[PDB]
Amino acid sequence: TEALYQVGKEFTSKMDLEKPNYIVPDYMPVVYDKLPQPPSHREAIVNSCVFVHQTLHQANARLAKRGGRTMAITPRHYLDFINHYANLFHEKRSELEEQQMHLNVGLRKIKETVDQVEELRRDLRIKSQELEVKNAAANDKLKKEEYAVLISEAQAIKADLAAVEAKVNRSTALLKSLSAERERWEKTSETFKNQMSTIAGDCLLSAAFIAYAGYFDQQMRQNLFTTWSHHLQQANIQFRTDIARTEYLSNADERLRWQASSLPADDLCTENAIMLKRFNRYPLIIDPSGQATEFIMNEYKDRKITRTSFLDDAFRKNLESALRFGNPLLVQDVESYDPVLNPVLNREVRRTGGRVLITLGDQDIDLSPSFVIFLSTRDPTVEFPPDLCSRVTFVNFTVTRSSLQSQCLNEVLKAERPDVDEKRSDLLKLQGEFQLRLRQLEKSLLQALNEVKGRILDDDTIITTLENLKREAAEVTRKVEETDIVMQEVETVSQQYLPLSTACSSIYFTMESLKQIHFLYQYSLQFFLDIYHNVLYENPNLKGVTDHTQRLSIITKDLFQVAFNRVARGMLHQDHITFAMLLARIKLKGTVGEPTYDAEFQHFLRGNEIVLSAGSTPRIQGLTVEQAEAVVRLSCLPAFKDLIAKVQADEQFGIWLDSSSPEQTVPYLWSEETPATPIGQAIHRLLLIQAFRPDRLLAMAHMFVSTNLGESFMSIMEQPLDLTHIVGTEVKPNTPVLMCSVPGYDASGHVEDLAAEQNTQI
Structure with a gap:
């Protein structure tokens, strides 16, 4: 902790980190034991920086405790954070200062114009009075050659007065045109003092996010940011909360360019692009889906980024070329990482005689500053x-x-309603261009007032540019609302297909978590997309259906069925009930007319955790001690409060308890104020069976799946596997057919017979 504090304080010395009005909190979240009792703003910042490093260790221990894959946190991560903290602070401070300066100049020029147009009115009144005197004197003297001169100079004043009033009217229009700009600029100039106060806190959160949060998923990244934000709040360090880290660490122009480089529109993905643009150490990218590798290739295409792999023999030559000519390089297969890159990644260079030499292997190589490796x-x-x-x-x-x-909402929109998707995609392009145009106009309008010399009225060209920029801004603004209303009509159409896309995400993440119960249950995102692709386009049930609602219902019904069939074919039969049960819960959550059943499912899964004392068991007649214990636990639910009385009052209860298949005729031992739906009926039957006849729980679980998903939902697993259709249609040539069997079973004969029947040589 002392080492981190000393490194942080030393590296932050160049930083300002000075705040005389810093108020020491009643309790300081001190992390360094030898921190002075009255800490200053700089000391509290470095203390917070150390705390960020320690929480990364705690976060890794948390994931490790939960059997999660963790990456080691090293002092190089700390050095990266402090380096990013220094860089962001200087960049944010320099940007903010320039903005305030630019806004100060524009406000002064507009204020100077306001003073000028005010004095023009007085000049206009003086000129009008002069014209009246000249005209009255000329007419009165005419009432009596030289008088012709008097009326001629009076006409000259008439032209001068008309010209002045024309300039006054034009200038009054300019004031109104820049009004909104003046009001906005005043507010930003007023809030300018606020941003400087919060820059130190904001840059600490951002720098910690880039240096540390790259490996973790969306949920853990929020946990670390919340943990850091809580520490800064409790340590009286100012930081903004409204602004998202995506917009703080990147600009709209860069985000638009990232979209043009096939970067998926996701907050996590945008953060990844920010890290790939702001990295001290060279990046290591994990993308099973592959858009990241493509995104890097298109992003560095102008720099001719070279693609290669560690397993390739030409990697050494390819790396040597990149180290010499300074071209970007992308190397895949880092699980086979080749250690000759250690000096390159560590940036161990010797600068002697204008030569930046790096020792790759046994050879000394001059290193070009433009080199970058991914x-x-x-x-x-x-x-x-x-x-x-x-x-x-x-x-x-x-x-x-x-x-x-x-992604799934977009895919269904392109499939079911292509015209709506085409309209939506066009509005994506139109809105982005309009926002880009608006940003360009704002910068140009500010720049014109920054470079104008003297007063706006002095130069007519400046006035014309201001009028054109406002007219273009007003016109581009008008296009924004009309695109907004059309985009709105798009969303009301997308609302109908929204529940299906919600179901699609639920299925995939259930499949992703299926690996927790068996190592063989590894399902990629592409496999789900193939299932989703099959339901949307290769659906035999959509042959003649034209109703949008009817087609959607068929798609939703078939999505659950096709997902089950494909997954359960590569699962042990004892786990088929688990997957269909979870798919039934997913579909149940998607029904508006059904209750949540949150408490019922909570007891169904954690009913054994309800600790009962020795006197808790009342020893109900006709029930085993373990059966009685399960009854009292079930009695905790509101619907089973009087279960014991109901059980004791039933003379036929003993007959049902010894039935071969009690799940078919489960008696009505639950009290409801209103009649329950058939799904809710099965849930209570499932709860009763688990307490009374756990040996029939699997049979009753199948009944619930029949109630939710259908009687024939699991029927296809009872039939022999049809390898003819699946291999010919559902399997791409790129995807291998993994035929895994339990001992005593060999599927080689299946392939030999299948190959013969197709008359395909194998």
């Missing part, structure tokens, strides 16, 4: 040694629920 893997579960983790910054491209919902 290392990528397609394995999200790959483990890395601690030294490799220290030498790179992690950039994990994980799939988030929000992004997958948007």
Whole structure:
């Protein structure tokens, strides 16, 4: 802790980090024991920086405790954070200062114009009085050659007065045209003092996010940011909360360019692009889906980024060329990382005689400043040694629920309603261009007032530019609302297909978590997209259906069925009930007319955790001690409060308790104020069976799936596997057919017979 504090304080010395009005909180979240009792603003900042490093250790221990894959946190991560903290502070401070200066100049020029147009009115009144005197004197003297001169100079004043009033009217129009700009600029100039107060806190959160949060998923990244934000709030360090880190660490122009480079529109993905643009250590990218590798290739295309792999023999030559000519390089298969890159990643260079020499292997090589290397893997579960983790910054491209919902909503929109999707995609392009145009006009309008010399009225060209910029701004603004209303009509159409996209994300993440119960249950995102692709376009049930609602209902029904069939074919039969049960819960959550059943399912899954004392069991007649214990636990639910009385009052209860298949005729031993739906009926039957006849729980679980998903939902698993159709249609030539069997079973005969029947040589 002392080492981190000393490193942080020393590296932050160049930083301002000075705030005389800093108020020491009643309790300081001190992390350094030898921190002085009255800490200053700089000391509190460095203390917070140390705290960020320690919480990364705690976060890793948390995930490790939960059997999660963790990467080692090293002092190089700390050095990256402090370096990013220094860089962001200087960049944010320099940007803010220039903005305030630019706004100060524009406000002064507009204020000077206001004073000028005010004095023009007085000049106009004086000129009008002069004209009246000249005209009256000329007419009166005419009432009596020289008088012709008097009326001629009076006409000259008439032209001069008319010209002045024309300039006054034009200038009055300019004031109104710049009014809104003046009001906005005053507010930003007023809030300018606020941004400087919060820059130190904001840059600490941002720098910690880039240096540390790359490897973790969406949920953990929020946990670390919340943990850091809580520490800064409790340590009386000012930081803004309204602004998202995506917009703080990147500009709209860069985000638009990232979209043009095929970067998916996701907050996590945008953060990854920010890390790939602001990295001290060379990035290590994890993307099983592969958009990150493509995004890097298009982003550095103008720099001719070279693609290669560690397993390739030409990697050494390719790396040597990149180190010499300074071209960007992307190397894949880092799970087979080749250690000759250690000096390159560590940036161990010797600058002697104008030559930046790096010793690659046994050869000394001159290093070009434009060199940059990206290392990528397609394995999200790959483990890395601690030294490799220290030498790179992690950039994990994980799939988030929000992004997958948007992807599936987009895919169904393109499929079911292509015209609406085409309209929506056009409005994406139109709105982005309009926002870009508005930003350009604002900068141009500010720049014109920054470079204008003297007063606006002095130069007519400046006035014309201001009028044109406002007219263009007003016109581009008008296009914004009309695109907004059309985009709004698009969303009301997208609302109908929204529940389906929500279901799609739920299925995939259930499949993703299926690996927790068996190592063989590994399902990629592409496999789900193939299932989603099959339902949308290869659906035999959509042959003649034209209703949009009817087609949607068929798609939703078939999505659950096709997902079950494909997954359960590569699952042990004892786990088929688990997957269909969870799919039934997913569909149940998607029904508006059904209750949540949150408490019922909570007891169904954690009913054994309800600790009962010795006197808790009342020893109900006709029930085993273990059966009686399960009854009291079930009695905790409101619907089973009087279960014991109902059980005791039933003479036929003993007959049902010894029935061969009690799940078919479960008696009505629950009290409801209103009649329950058939799904709710099965849930209570499931709860009763678990307490009384656990040996029939699997049979009753199948009944619930029949109640929710259908009687024939699991019927296809009872039929022999049809390898003819699946291989010919559902399997791409790129996807291998993994035929895994329990001992005593060999599927080689299946392939031999299948190959003969197609008359395909194997």
